[PDB]
Ligand binder design. Structure first.
Ligand SMILES: CO[C@]1(C(=O)O)C[C@H](O)[C@@H](NC(=O)CO)[C@H]([C@H](O)[C@H](O)CO)O1
Length: 161
C-alpha cells in the first residue's frame, strides 16, 4: 500500500500529501521555493556536533551556515529558511531523529514539516505565498502519503520503515 520509493527529482507535489524522505548520507535532504517570499532547505546533521561553520550548496549556490547538534546519539534535521531572494538563512525548531526519516507537505497556505524528538514527534509550519505551486527537489529516495493517512507517516517518522 506504501507508495514508493521514487528516485531523486524535482516535481510539483499535490497539496495535502506528505513527501516522506529517506536520506542515507548527511547533508541537504530536500529543497523548495515559491521564488517570492519562501525558501526552505532541510539539512541532515550528524549526531554530536559542536558549533561550527559549514558550506552547503543551497538552490545551486554555495552558502556558509553555522551548525550544531547537541544530541550525542540522534540525528538533527534542520530547516534553513529565507523570506526574500537576497535575505539571510535562518533556523527554526529542529527534529531530533533516531530513524533518519523526514517529511514535508503543502497545506493551507503553508509548508509543514515534522518537529521535536522521536519517538514523540509533532508538526510545524511556515506560511508560504502561492503554496500550492511550490516545486520540491528531493536529493534522496522518497514516498508519497495522503494527509488522510497522516498517522501512518507519523509512525514512520517515529519508528522507521
Ligand atoms: C508568521 O508566523 C509563523 C508562520 O505562519 O509562518 C508561525 C509559525 O508557527 C512559525 N513556525 C516556526 O517557528 C517553525 O519552527 C513561522 C516561522 O517563524 C517563519 O515562517 C519563519 O520564516 O512563523
Amino acid at each position: 500500500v506504501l507508495d514508493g520509493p521514487y528516485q531523486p527529482t524535482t516535481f510539483n507535489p499535490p497539496v495535502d500529501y506528505w513527501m516522506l524522505l529517506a536520506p542515507t548520507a548527511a547533508g541537504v535532504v530536500v529543497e523548495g521555493t515559491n521564488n517570492t517570499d519562501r525558501w526552505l532547505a532541510t539539512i541532515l546533521v550528524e549526531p554530536n556536533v559542536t558549533s561550527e561553520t559549514r558550506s552547503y550548496t543551497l538552490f545551486g549556490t554555495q552558502e556558509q551556515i553555522t551548525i550544531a547538534n547537541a544530541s550525542q546519539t540522534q540525528w538533527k534535521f534542520i530547516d534553513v529558511v529565507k523570506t526574500t531572494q537576497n535575505g539571510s538563512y535562518s533556523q527554526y525548531g529542529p527534529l531530533q531523529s533516531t530513524p533518519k526519516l523526514y517529511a514535508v507537505m503543502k497545506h493551507n497556505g503553508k509548508i509543514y514539516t515534522y518537529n521535536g524528538e522521536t519517538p514523540n514527534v509533532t508538526t510545524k509550519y511556515y506560511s508560504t505565498t502561492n503554496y500550492d505551486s511550490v516545486n520540491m527537489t528531493a536529493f534522496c529516495d522518497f514516498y508519497i502519503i495522503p494527509r488522510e493517512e497522516e498517522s501512518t507517516c507519523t509512525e514512520y517518522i517515529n519508528n522507521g520503515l
